[PDB]
């Protein structure tokens, strides 16, 4: 059975794209092995439904990630942070897209991404919650607004809640992580007024002889 040593990465850090997990991009496993030595080194985040997400990725068996052309009209892309530096360079989750002010401007976004393939798409995205109100308006002109991610089966509304969070590597703020599955013939539709940590594409999601295990045993 094909073993993938998670080393210093957790399955979710490997998923999201934590800089020190770039080696895990698009990898497969019959068994993913999480080590107790693992850490995170990127923006502070919270995955409500963490355990569920970890489980469904583990039994899918791979992190095959396919990029997609989302049309983010009038908004600055590829934001980064001190909390997620690659070396001395500000970086971010390699599968997430931090949208923000472009020339002191932020328009509401309304984008769709139709699934016309023969398989299910897994979209991982999030929502940024600023520490202060100044932080809100600097990054997204507009005050706290909503994120609405809808399909023909699901519905996911998130309201950003501004407030001081626990200090993690330079930041007193946090990102909420959410996931969506889009069936063939279904369509991913994102309406966002701001605070959206956008998806860069999708994971091909399946199910099979695939799992995950926690262990510090030497793979030999």
């Amino acid at each position, epitope marked *: 059975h094909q073993i993938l040593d998670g080393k210093n990465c957790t399955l979710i850090d490997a998923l999201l794209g934590d*800089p020190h997990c770039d*080696d895990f991009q698009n990898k497969e496993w019959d068994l993913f092995v999480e080590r107790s030595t693992a850490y995170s080194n990127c923006y502070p985040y919270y995955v409500p439904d963490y355990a569920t997400l970890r489980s469904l990725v583990a039994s899918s068996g791979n992190l095959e990630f396919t*990029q*997609e052309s989302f049309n983010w009209t009038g908004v600055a892309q590829d934001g*980064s942070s001190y909390a997620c530096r*690659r070396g001395s360079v500000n*970086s971010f989750f390699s599968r997430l897209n931090w949208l923000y002010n472009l020339n002191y401007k932020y328009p509401e976004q309304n984008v769709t991404m139709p699934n*016309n393939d023969k398989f299910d798409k897994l979209y991982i995205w999030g929502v940024h919650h600023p520490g202060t109100d100044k932080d809100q308006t600097n990054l997204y002109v507009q005050a706290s607004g909503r994120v609405i991610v809808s399909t023909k089966r699901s519905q996911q509304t998130v309201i950003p809640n501004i407030g001081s969070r626990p200090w993690v590597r330079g930041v007193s703020s946090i990102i909420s992580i959410y996931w969506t599955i889009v069936k063939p013939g279904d369509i991913l539709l994102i309406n966002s007024t701001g605070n959206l940590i956008a998806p860069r*594409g999708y994971f091909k999601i399946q199910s099979g002889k695939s799992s995950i295990m926690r262990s510090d045993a030497h793979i030999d």
Partner: antibody
């Protein structure tokens, strides 16, 4: 611009190891990515791992994983391809290549179009 | 694993004619992550097209790129004797994969 310059052709026996260099420009090395791609009969083109010398960060293909190492030398602007535990089907021409887009700190494109290419290095594996 | 299937295997046309090359992918590939290459016997691949229709620096305008989803195209408007080479498509939406190649012969 750079005109990537690789090592010369090699001959290795099965179970041995190569190191194939690539010499880049200051710009190519510190603000672009370097990729290895190999070619053979029946293997039209095979993307092997890639590197961002600027970060030292890597991504390898599983096919060559825990065998293929991609390292750099910042003082010479060179990227090295160390394929270990050589197999007869590793006989191929190994090219280095540059990522067409420039480095994006938030999302290092290890998967890209390949702008400039090295001359190719034939590694023959045989006893 | 995105499979790239090129059509035809071999194409033979005289100078001045238009060459049309086709590429079929196993997954829907965004047209902003697809490239075309030229490889003349013994050379390294030369980037012709990136972003499906964006022409690379130092490439002639007779080289045209098109396509979307799974159906992509390379058009060579006015063949020269210099265009005798193998052509390749590549997707870069996931870890880079390439086609089997199309061999273009120039008639004489």
């Amino acid at each position: 611009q750079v005109q990537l310059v690789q090592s010369g052709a090699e001959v290795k026996k099965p179970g041995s190891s190569v190191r194939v260099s690539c010499k880049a420009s200051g710009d190519t090395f510190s603000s672009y990515s370097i990729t290895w791609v190999r070619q053979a009969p029946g293997h039209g083109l095979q993307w092997m791992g890639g590197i961002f010398p600027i970060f030292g960060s890597t991504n390898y293909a599983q096919k060559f994983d825990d065998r293929l190492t991609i390292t750099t030398d910042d003082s010479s602007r060179t990227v090295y391809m160390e394929l270990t535990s050589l197999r007869l089907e590793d006989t191929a021409v190994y090219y280095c290549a540059r990522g067409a887009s420039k480095v994006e700190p938030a999302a290092p494109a290890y998967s890209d179009a390949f702008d400039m290419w090295g001359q190719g290095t034939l590694v023959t594996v045989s006893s | 694993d995105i499979v790239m299937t090129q059509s035809p295997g071999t194409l033979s046309l005289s100078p001045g004619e238009r060459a049309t090359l086709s590429c079929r992918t196993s997954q829907g590939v965004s047209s902003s992550y697809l490239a075309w290459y030229q490889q003349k016997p013994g050379q390294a691949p030369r980037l012709l097209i990136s972003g499906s229709s964006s022409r690379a620096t130092g490439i002639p305008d007779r080289f045209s790129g098109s396509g979307s989803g799974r159906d992509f195209t390379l058009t060579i408007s006015r063949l020269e004797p210099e265009d005798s080479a193998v052509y390749y498509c590549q997707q870069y939406a996931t870890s880079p994969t390439f086609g089997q190649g199309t061999r273009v012969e120039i008639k004489r």
